[PDB]
Write a protein that binds this ligand. Structure first.
Ligand SMILES: Nc1ncnc2c1ncn2[C@@H]1O[C@H](CSCC[C@H](N)C(=O)O)[C@@H](O)[C@H]1O
Ligand SMILES: [Zn+2]
Length: 678
């Protein structure tokens, strides 16, 4: 019941069916003076820079490993050394059983060994297909050829042939573009080895002889600077902000001053105060240099960026007053991309992306009328298509003259035949979309090929956008024993993408409700993959762990339970300002009763004066359930947002949306990635 292209259907169905010498002269010498060579002959086989060799290791049942050579040289001992980077097999990576048999992945670990211990030379090549939708058809033809010859080698029992496409980084959990310009140089300077030695050099305390500054965790810590200190170190809260006063005689300790946050005095004091408020103190304490977690900046109330964004992304505080703990009271002293939001919903994600300045929703797809109406009301310029995705994809396939490249049922064709001329003419075309985002719903192969999934994959395959965003609930990496996640990664890699995945928590970005969302980024090989945003608010949630292969694990972002630069947001900061109502109220347009007091209410009330959607069905103090506007505030929806349909449709839109601050942070990261362009 799902219209999918040939490639995705084929992949999913295939998965679900079940004497030593040198050559030439030396080219130069290494740093130590050892002459390096280029070509060698051993046992009738030829070894050259850029090839792949096999080594001998224990467990003879496992077939020998593959090493991509980097450089070979001759030492004064008169031996023959060769240095090679490991080529990880696809079956041992996160993909698992769904990985390609002939696929290898580059790694960052390299080792040197004697040449006499190699088993032999294996064929190896690197493929760099041009990127674009127009070449797409041609590509599959080549793939068909790749299906034949190798199969012939299976019949003739010839040795297999491998290839490499992308570099695997389990520490970042991503497949990235091969650094071609920094590989295969044959100069004795391995980039991975230099990176590893630089990393090993760091993470060690540097005892600077100058009594002005030092180095910690690869950062420079100077005198008269503001630092963060873990409250547990000081004999859930935020980072204790201090000022580095002096260093006294793993050999020096730091004596620092102190600042007191408004939440320390009383809850009510912070309930009516800013988020960058601090109090001076005369308390000085001595700590080891390993208790510092970052750098802050405390400024005056005379020069500010005047960009009061939400959520806050820069570490900056201010303090113009004094304090005294003894008394107990404080005293005075060109890049926007056209996008298509499949499964648009109420439009929260699209609103956040557009607010971030990287997206403008020129198209959308919706299943239910009220959600499409809400999207149209909030996004007037978005051409919302209120219909099922199968018929819409079939229509664009027919318009593009590729009706033979889609597995569509009769119902999809007959429903697509009823579209008018205007609807057909307003459809997009390949080459006009540079961004595709949306989260498909989630819920022997014949019963799984009708799932709402693979529709997004077919859309991405047909359009081939520059960037690709996918999102689901936190259990997307555990559905069907994780098979669907592996298959999605395999399909995205087969298309020729750089992909990455990560679990994010919405409770550490300015939202009072905890929510875990799994995101997958994909990009073209010529573009830079965006980085994950950094949390700034504390929340009682452990590290976000994704189960990889070989027992390894990867975390998208650092934990925030230990501390964060900003205090958490509670319930009173969200719904403590709206006027009270009675049970079963059914009035839409009201007026505000009280002025904004808390920081969150001040930020979210904006300039509007007309309260809307304060409707509840038939709360710690009132004997009634939360209203629609209360839920919208709890999810970070600004009051200016508009809805549609009845109350049940509004609640369903609320419960299936994405917090706008999270989308804003992701869009800011994407904007940074776009600006950081080669
Ligand atoms: N076949 C289909 N085509 C389009 N939308 C569909 C669909 N099946 C379900 N939907 C809708 O897709 C939504 C799933 S949740 C998606 C929310 C959206 N990403 C947002 O940011 O708000 C629901 O509104 C659901 O009704
Ligand atoms: Zn090296």
């Amino acid at each position: 019941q799902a219209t999918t292209t040939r490639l995705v259907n084929r992949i999913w169905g295939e998965f679900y069916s079940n004497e030593i010498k040198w050559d030439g002269e030396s080219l130069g010498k290494t740093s130590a003076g050892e002459p390096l060579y280029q070509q060698a002959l051993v046992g009738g086989e030829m070894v050259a820079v850029g090839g792949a060799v096999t080594l001998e290791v224990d467990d003879p049942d496992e077939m020998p490993a593959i090493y991509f050579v980097e450089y070979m040289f001759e030492s004064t001992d008169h031996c023959k050394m060769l240095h090679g980077r490991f080529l990880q097999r696809g079956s041992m990576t996160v993909l698992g059983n769904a990985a390609n048999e002939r696929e290898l992945f580059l790694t960052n670990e390299c080792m040197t060994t004697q040449l006499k211990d190699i088993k032999g030379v294996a064929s190896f090549e690197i493929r760099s297909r041009p990127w674009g939708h127009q070449y797409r058809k041609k590509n599959i033809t080549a793939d068909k050829l790749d299906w034949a010859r190798a199969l012939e080698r299976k019949v003739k029992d010839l040795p297999t042939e491998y290839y490499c496409k992308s570099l695997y980084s389990p520490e970042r959990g991503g497949f990235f573009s091969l650094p071609l310009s920094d590989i295969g140089r044959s100069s004795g300077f391995c980039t991975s080895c230099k990176i590893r030695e630089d990393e090993e050099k760091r993470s060690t305390i540097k005892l600077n002889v100058s009594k002005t500054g030092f180095f910690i965790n690869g950062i420079e810590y100077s005198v008269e600077d503001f630092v963060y200190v873990n409250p547990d170190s000081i004999g859930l809260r935020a980072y204790v902000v201090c000022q580095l006063l002096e260093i006294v005689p793993g050999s020096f300790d730091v004596k620092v001053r102190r600042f007191y946050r408004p939440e320390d005095v009383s809850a009510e004091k912070a309930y009516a105060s800013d988020i960058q408020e601090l109090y001076f103190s005369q308390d000085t304490v001595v700590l080891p240099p390993g208790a510092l977690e970052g750098k802050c900046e405390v400024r005056k109330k005379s020069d500010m960026p005047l960009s009061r964004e939400y959520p806050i992304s820069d570490h900056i505080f201010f303090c113009d007053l004094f304090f005294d703990t003894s008394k107990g009271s404080l005293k005075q002293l060109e890049i926007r991309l056209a996008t298509l939001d499949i499964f648009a919903g109420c439009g929260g994600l699209s609103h956040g992306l557009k607010k971030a300045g990287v997206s403008d929703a020129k198209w959308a797809i919706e299943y239910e009328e009220p959600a499409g109406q809400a999207f149209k009301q909030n996004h007037p310029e978005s051409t919302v298509f209120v219909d099922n995705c199968n018929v819409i994809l079939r229509a664009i396939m027919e318009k593009g003259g590729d009706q033979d490249d889609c597995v569509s049922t009769t119902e999809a064709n007959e429903l697509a035949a009823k579209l008018t001329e205007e609807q057909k003419s307003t459809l997009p075309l390949p080459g006009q979309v540079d961004f595709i985002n949306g989260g498909p719903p989630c819920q022997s192969w014949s019963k799984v090929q009708c799932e709402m999934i693979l529709a997004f994959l077919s859309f991405a395959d047909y359009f081939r956008p520059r960037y690709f965003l996918l999102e689901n609930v936190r259990t997307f990496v555990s559905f069907n024993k994780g098979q669907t996640f592996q298959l999605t990664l395999a399909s995205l890699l087969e298309m020729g993408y750089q992909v990455r995945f990560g679990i994010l928590e919405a409770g550490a970005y300015g939202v009072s409700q905890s929510r875990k969302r799994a995101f997958i980024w994909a990009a073209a090989p010529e573009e830079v993959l965006p980085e994950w945003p950094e949390p700034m608010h504390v929340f009682g949630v452990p590290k976000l762990k994704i189960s990889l292969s070989q027992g390894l694990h990867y975390a998208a972002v650092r934990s925030t339970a230990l501390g964060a630069p900003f205090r958490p947001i509670t319930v009173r900061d969200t719904i403590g300002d709206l006027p009270s109502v009675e049970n079963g109220d059914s009035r839409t347009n009201k007026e505000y009763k009280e002025v904004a007091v808390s920081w969150f209410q001040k930020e979210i009330r904006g300039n509007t004066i007309a309260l809307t959607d304060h409707i509840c069905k038939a709360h710690p103090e009132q004997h009634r359930i939360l209203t629609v506007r209360e839920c919208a505030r709890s999810q970070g929806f600004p009051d200016s947002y508009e809805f549609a349909g009845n109350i049940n449709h509004k609640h369903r839109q609320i419960g299936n949306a994405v917090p706008p601050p999270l989308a804003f942070a992701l869009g800011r990261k994407l904007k940074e990635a776009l600006h950081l362009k080669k």
